[PDB]
Amino acid sequence: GKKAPNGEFAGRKLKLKRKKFRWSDIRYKRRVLRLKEKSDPLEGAPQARGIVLEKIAVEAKQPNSGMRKAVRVQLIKNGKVVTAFCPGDGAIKFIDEHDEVIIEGIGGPKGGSMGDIPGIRYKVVKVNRVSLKELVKGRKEKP
Template structure:
């Protein structure tokens, strides 16, 4: 064991302070140094090397909405137990990326070069569709009754 891991374990209480704030009846301990992580044991290091955690990117890249231009309209088929024709569009987003977005509701007026507003929210039974179009904004009209 190296010196740092021994020192970390012996002086772990130095890195923590007790909050005086009462959260749901319990005192909480928060780290003073946020950079310190729990050290791995020798068995854990021997079993597999340390890899940094990969943060998953949200479909709209941390933004609530993105504007996009329709490249083409698609009809996608859902996965096995379901059977339908899901109306989707291929969109070039304002950040330069391309994605497939679902058009909710019955009927739409989208064609190539239409402008749409997309939000996050995947289509559970169609793989690869992680965005939904917002009805009533830009060129995508409300659902007609």
């Protein structure tokens, strides 16, 4: 039937209808009730600083085949431990045990994992404040 109530006085019922159904969207819920914040490990910080605790390699997702290095990092801000992918070929050699490192979002879909490798959400940008990409290019040197 006709979309209702198309009345000149029924603005109230229209407003309750729309407010009610706006909760059906997921992103509005994630914004309003702040669910990402109450589940946040990084508390909305675009960056963080942490200490590497172990080097771990991961098998890619099939049908892709390959071994990707990463490090399990304990975060100074709150103490939680999370995996951190290391980019750049021949790069994990420059990340070691008990290293001051700088970690950053990895920018997959929905802010999730990137491509084949799932779960991992973050990447290494500096080790001891020294840019990982530079040392991958090799012009600078870790202290």
